[PDB]
Amino acid sequence: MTNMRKTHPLFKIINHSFIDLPAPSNISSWWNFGSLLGVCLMVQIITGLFLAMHYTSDTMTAFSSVTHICRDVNYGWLIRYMHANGASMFFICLFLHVGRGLYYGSYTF
Amino acid sequence: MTNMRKTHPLFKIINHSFIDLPAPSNISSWWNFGSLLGVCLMVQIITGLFLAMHYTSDTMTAFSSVTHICRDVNYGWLIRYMHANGASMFFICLFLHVGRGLYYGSYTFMETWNIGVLLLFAVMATAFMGYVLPWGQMSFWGATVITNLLSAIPYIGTTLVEWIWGGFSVDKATLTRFFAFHFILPFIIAALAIVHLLFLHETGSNNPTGLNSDADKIPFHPYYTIKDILGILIMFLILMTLVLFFPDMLGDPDNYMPANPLNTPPHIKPEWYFLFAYAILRSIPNKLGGVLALILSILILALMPFLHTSKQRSLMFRPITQILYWILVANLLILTWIGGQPVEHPFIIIGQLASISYFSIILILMPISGIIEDKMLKLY
Amino acid sequence: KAVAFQNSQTRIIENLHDVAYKNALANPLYCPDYRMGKITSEELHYFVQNHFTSARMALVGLGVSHSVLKQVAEQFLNMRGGLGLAGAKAKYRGGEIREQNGDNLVHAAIVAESAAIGNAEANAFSVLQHLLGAGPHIKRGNNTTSLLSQSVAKGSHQPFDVSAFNASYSDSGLFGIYTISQAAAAGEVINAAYNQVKAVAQGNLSSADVQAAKNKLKAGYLMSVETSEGFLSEIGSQALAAGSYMPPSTVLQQIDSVADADVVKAAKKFVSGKKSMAASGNLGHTPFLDEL
Amino acid sequence: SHTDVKVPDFSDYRRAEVLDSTKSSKESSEARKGFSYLVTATTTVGVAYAAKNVVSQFVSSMSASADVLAMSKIEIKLSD
Amino acid sequence: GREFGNLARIRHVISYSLSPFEQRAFPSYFSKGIPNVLRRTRERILRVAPPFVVVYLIYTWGNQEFEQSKR
Amino acid sequence: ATFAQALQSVPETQVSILDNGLRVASEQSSHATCTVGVWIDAGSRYETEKNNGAGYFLEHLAFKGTKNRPGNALEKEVESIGAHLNAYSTREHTAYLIKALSKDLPKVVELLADIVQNSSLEDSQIEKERDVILREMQENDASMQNVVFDYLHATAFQGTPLAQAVEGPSENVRRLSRTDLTDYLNRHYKAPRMVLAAAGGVEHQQLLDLAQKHLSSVSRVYEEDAVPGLTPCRFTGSEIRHRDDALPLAHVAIAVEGPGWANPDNVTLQVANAIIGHYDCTYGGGVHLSSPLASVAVANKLCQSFQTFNISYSDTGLLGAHFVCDAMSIDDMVFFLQGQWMRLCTSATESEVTRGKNILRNALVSHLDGTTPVCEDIGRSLLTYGRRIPLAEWESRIQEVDAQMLRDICSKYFYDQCPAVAGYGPIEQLPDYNRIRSGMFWLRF
Amino acid sequence: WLDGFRKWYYNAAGFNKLGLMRDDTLHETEDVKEAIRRLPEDLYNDRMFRIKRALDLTMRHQILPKDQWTKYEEDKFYLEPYLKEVIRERKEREEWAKK
Amino acid sequence: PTIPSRLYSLLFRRTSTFALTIAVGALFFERAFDQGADAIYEHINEGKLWKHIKHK
Amino acid sequence: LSRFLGPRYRELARNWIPTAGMWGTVGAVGLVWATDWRLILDWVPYINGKF
């Protein structure tokens, strides 16, 4: 039999990326912000995906569709304010990732 | 000092997938349809980019936004009819790609085929789920009929159909749901096509003859990019003939009224790539059997890796398996005509006999055809 | 070949036989690198057709009944009942090889002609081997009755290992001195060992030491007997070459029948015969065969 | 050589049931494994709560709206 | 299909190929093309043709029988 | 006859206790050789950080100096009788062995009685043997599997008396004087921790009369009534990794604490260890070899050799696998070794355990074929098991082992346990210890 | 009549026109690829020449003339004593795995 | 054996028992945690919520 | 199939019966806990009342 993580190519991509990646043992909480940016970008994509199921874009009923998201559909207030505060968290993690790149001299990449 | 196409890593994977990929030299015009599906998916994505910039999703003015695109938006009629006939071009390229896959022995690329039928399920779902979005009478009643036929399952059916409706019927939340789904689904189709290309590039491509093509290899550039450009130009010839000369011929003319729930069309009919699906669903008298025949009809060509009883790979050297394959595509054409026809005696018995014969070809008669090929060629 | 040439003994044992014999026994035990890639199955089939046959085959069994083994041998060994292709007679070659290795431990061995196994000169030559130290009888000891080790260690102080080895085949045999030394004192080691065998050849011997050599040979033959794979190898070689099984007590009577004058005659035969020397290591102080 | 290598004093890190050298670790092996896997399982029950409840919020948001639930009840035909 | 150098182990086969610029782009396009298209359609028209005339017979049967039954 | 009748017909070992408590055992058979050896229960265990190399030094030193026959008179007498000697020293046993003819038996047991009691210790021989021990310990770094087994014993039993080597470190060799060695001789060479093994060619009443004449009244009573005491040693699952990237071949061992000698389950842990088996690159079995780790290793060219061991001590054992591998397949060998280990531990079959039971029966009778290793088994079994277990009782312990029994006591001694990991070579593609632990316990079961 | 029907099936299969015999159009499974490792060198060399010439002919979408077609009586079953050995060895391997 | 040792030996060492413990504790954590969180919420405002003013 | 049917594979399947059945009950109890079935959660006495 064969090793599946180094045999299957879809498993070879995730083995070279997230399982058996050569990573330094040094790296701090500032290096976690890249995976935090990826995970919060994924929850912004999922959050806006479930926010666009009731959003209507026109010059009359966009604010009516936004307040229909906020109070009329079941628990859409959490998704709308999660999307706004997660865009804020997206830029918090992006500015701290940029500050980590200036902070630790990774301009050579 | 160094080669950029083997040094730079984005250029390394672009060079490995596109420039000097080891490809067999003897592939026909039917092998161009995968890259034609890639560029047709890209032109569907870019026409949807330039189509959703003037599209408002709510049932009061979805059809008014569609007519504002077709009349008041400069060159918006070209974008909308190019998107509809490019969906038709996408499905005829997908049907010829899956006919090549059933023909030329490429069942055995197993993970490629399984992520292909997952991609085909997602393409059919986004095609129906974008066909709702013009909000005509035929689109609304087709949405009602196709989602209402998912309610045949006991104990999860009405929960599933109020979940997929957002109400007792198709409404504003259903249309905005289908527009958000129709945005999100072709990008995961494109990522599925990228990893479908990765699962292809694990083991290379294949020839029409079913042989190991490792002895004779040509680079993909410039031998296959100019065949790609020639296929792109003939595909754009048929696609631009479809948009600029016969725009509503492959489409349904009954979609171009405003949507009204108080009346019904005299025959309810989905699109031409869903006609064989609607005929297979209409063949079974039980409704749960119809939706199980729907799911088994889309999923039964994924069982073709497990239905390879013959020791020869392709159907190039299989003469009566070719007879059964062309009677399968004849059954598919008869299924398309039967789904285009309304529900009358005697179209129902023709659809029943043709669906029974199509399932007998795809399940029973072609493995015993491969058995009688290897019995007539004295393998055992 | 790489695992068997990690050990330094087998390499110069093979090149020792290559320089000590002319055509037959000079063929190596391991396959050389020029034939690696050229061994054909037709030549394998021709060799197993011409040399796996019944009149040279001996099949021995420990723990197996004789009638059962007779039935299995007659039910599967009716095929290939000839005498076989005759092997060539080995003739002595002589000369040296001397080659460089790259370690401080230099292995150098000087042999000459001894009689075939089954001869009274070979029975004298094995007891002359056990007089001059066939191996370490004591783990981590000094081997203080072996005359080679005494006459080398009286002049040398570096770590070493001086033994004598005997290898008697069906036609001709080799007896000689195997010295493992450091690269600086190896000339003094080899010349002191050769002067010790010169002292045995003139006859500076003690009869109690000859009796201790006889008891060492009898005990070492009992070490060869006492393991069941060694006992199977012993009667397989006896039934293969001689075709008859002497008792081990009869072997002890032959070793007790070997006396001192045969040891003196065999030492004179070894020191007067043409020699062959195989050496390996840093060779700046390794003496030549003309210099001995 | 190889025999001059000794593992140093790990007394500041190791647990108190392992810290004595006259006892075996197989007696407290089940205790340390059933403490650390209890920590793992008590994390995983909250991870399963966060993966169940948020998914239930998103599924009930994908379900029908409260305005649609108010309008879907028909007008009462009453006694006359 | 791993890479472009370690794929096959073939032997004693010689391939001659001319230039794109030392030869005609359409070398005997009609007199060697229309017999080749005729030979390929002769090889495969007996396998691709009678299911489609079964399709056309079922199509004309269904149309004329539905128009007969709707009287 | 059959197998059970034949192993019944294997002769018994009469074991008898002298007037001081020393144990004498013999196995009379047909051969004329005679393999008398003294096994002492001293080793690297029952040594502190001080006098650490005393057992290896006394094993080296018991042939060079004697009170009654001084100098090399032991060597002169044992080559007058023409015999062979051996002296192996382990963590719990040291021994002295003479293989000889059976007519030299009072000379053999008189030489053993002058070795184990009346050994003289001259300081010139102490300095010379200290230089030879330092040169041999410098030479022992090439013995790479011995280096990895010593690293595994250092990292598996840290803080215990089993952490130290049998040889002792170079800072402890140079301070070993004569009085520490004779304190070690007066403490750990006591008579009821000593057996006298003979094997074939002897008579037991002759051996007991010669042991009454020579090996009686060695030493029984301690100095200040200070008895030595065995302690249960802590197994610490750890990782040591000596990284030498210029060195060619990586030797990596992984071991779990096994039950040891006196616990009765060494047969079932050995039949699991023999299902896993062993491979070296000179074995000509190829892909068609029965052990699937060796079949996978030669199928995808993983390692040069692997050896699965059950090294046992009193209540504490190391059972595991040591592999000589390349620099590029240690992750593959670790994953396939843990996969074969816990494929054995989850899905053991009757064909697999009857293959292992047959290979254990053949391995035990091939080990106890020869006179010198059957005396090794007599001495090790008399010091550890108390009695000496005959092979009919070993067959009765083997024949009760089934795949269900193997599955649960493998779940006792294998599943989710922290192992000790040692490595000398290019140990970069060894996984880290959390990946070793995540590759232990299975994602399905 | 059965040999005539088999010759008509050989003509209708199409690889006699294209330049291949019976054992070149096998699906390359692990048994067939083990037999690919187990052919002799000359049979391997003209087999891969016949596959390369067949790939050249189906690239050009044409066949050889009728004088150099591989006849049914000119067909040799070269792979069959290797493929039957590989199939029976795989069968005894799966029977030992069942045992 | 101590307190976590028996539950390690009977419901934590196998991954199926681990997941069954996780799921059964998930259901009990759902009901007990929702009851405790609503109890501490109605203790942090008894009379402000719609319960306990529903007398009208 | 034909190579997968045998005595050793039946013994391996018998060895893998209880943990795969317990994983099936893990999937069933997790599906019940995810979907909150009204027939099944009204039988457990800790969630007996109204939830």
Ligand code: HEM
């Ligand atoms: C779009 C949002 C971003 C995502 C999702 C993202 C993702 C990641 C990830 C996953 C890593 C590896 C984890 C790590 O080593 O920290 C990483 C590292 C890195 N990223 Fe980003 N990144 C983003 C934005 C940026 C930006 C704006 C820059 C440029 C300033 C940048 C430059 C780097 C560099 C230089 C590193 C490697 C050195 C280091 O991590 O300290 N990233 N990023």
Ligand code: HEM
């Ligand atoms: C492709 C995934 C996304 C979709 C479909 C999406 C869709 C939407 C929609 C429909 C709204 C309006 C509803 C509302 O919040 O009132 C919105 C608001 C917003 N989105 Fe996104 N969005 C996505 C990703 C993102 C990302 C990645 C960011 C961060 C850069 C972001 C930032 C915002 C902001 C700041 C608002 C306004 C918040 C507010 O005041 O309500 N979105 N998005």
Ligand code: HEM
């Ligand atoms: C609609 C999006 C699709 C795209 C973009 C796509 C893309 C491709 C590409 C680029 C190739 C290689 C052909 C070449 O470049 O010469 C290919 C081949 C292949 N595809 Fe797809 N494909 C799609 C749909 C499917 C589906 C639905 C299936 C499953 C039925 C499938 C199965 C295969 C197989 C088996 C091959 C290998 C045989 C051949 O080359 O024709 N593809 N595809």
Ligand code: HEM
């Ligand atoms: C992510 C890219 C895509 C976007 C943004 C998109 C967007 C849209 C929009 C806004 C409409 C409504 C306008 C109209 O009535 O034509 C639409 C309609 C439609 N789309 Fe897409 N689409 C995309 C990809 C696709 C794909 C890949 C298909 C083919 C499966 C497809 C098939 C359709 C169809 C059949 C219609 C209905 C055409 C009509 O009846 O007017 N779309 N799409």
